[PDB]
Amino acid sequence: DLPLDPLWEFPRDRLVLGKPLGEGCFGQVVRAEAFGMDPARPDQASTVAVKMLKDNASDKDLADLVSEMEVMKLIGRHKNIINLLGVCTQEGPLYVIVECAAKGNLREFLRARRPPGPDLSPDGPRSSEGPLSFPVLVSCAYQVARGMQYLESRKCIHRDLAARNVLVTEDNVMKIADFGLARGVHHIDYYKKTSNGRLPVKWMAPEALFDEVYTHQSDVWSFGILLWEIFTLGGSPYPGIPVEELFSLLREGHRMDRPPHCPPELYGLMRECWHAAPSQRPTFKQLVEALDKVLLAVSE
């Protein structure tokens, strides 16, 4: 039914759908095996993620997914985003084929890799040493900023940027996901709590929350929250603060405290991303350069 785009069109029979990876407001994501995604090797197997409508698919749900697909085609390719690989639009359900991140989202990645606690018995030379180190945490922050810098250059606003919308690959490469979606910004339930207990409003910039205004600088605010998430190793922002309290606190200029085991450099960056005036927040280009200096300094 949709027009044929031979640039991106991929034979659906070359896909073998596997285990589902999650759901969203519109559409779901399924792990899949692809054969000949590289046209030079028609029988080569590769692991991809497939986006597709649910069974309750409205015309709006289809429109949103179709819209996302077209955004995917225009943004282009970058190392730190979820890239479009192909689409299935002919003779069958709509498939949007993208890259697959084997290690899940950034939030769960960090939470599963929190350091050993005080109960754990000393067994071996490294039982006090956890999977995560400071330079790697900075590297994660750096890669997200580079990805956002790319998206910004392509005039793309994320509008949700969070650790849950950042995906981790086999080689611990950060990849920004779901950046080109229609997120229904004129009708957000600010009290909405997701199934994993997330309050998405805790990532909204003031001008986005109060004035419904979204810019790249509003994404910078969200990046600041994302920084806090990283150095809390998957912690939820504004700890133990209900949405009603968040409203008045934000109006009073309240900001999150400096998390434990976090150098003043990065909390400084967090506070810069949380400046009231969007023009006094660092650009993503400035964030990349700033995070690079810190990363180089710890990369002996």
Ligand SMILES: *C(=O)c1ccc2c(n1)c(C(=O)Nc1cc(NCCOC)c(C#N)cn1)cn2CCC
């Ligand atoms: C693919 O190799 C793969 C294998 C195991 C995976 C896995 N992916 C994922 C996963 O989350 N994959 C994934 C998910 C999404 N979207 C979910 C929404 O995130 C914002 C996308 C996209 N777009 C790409 N890849 C999890 N697991 C197993 C958990 C360890």
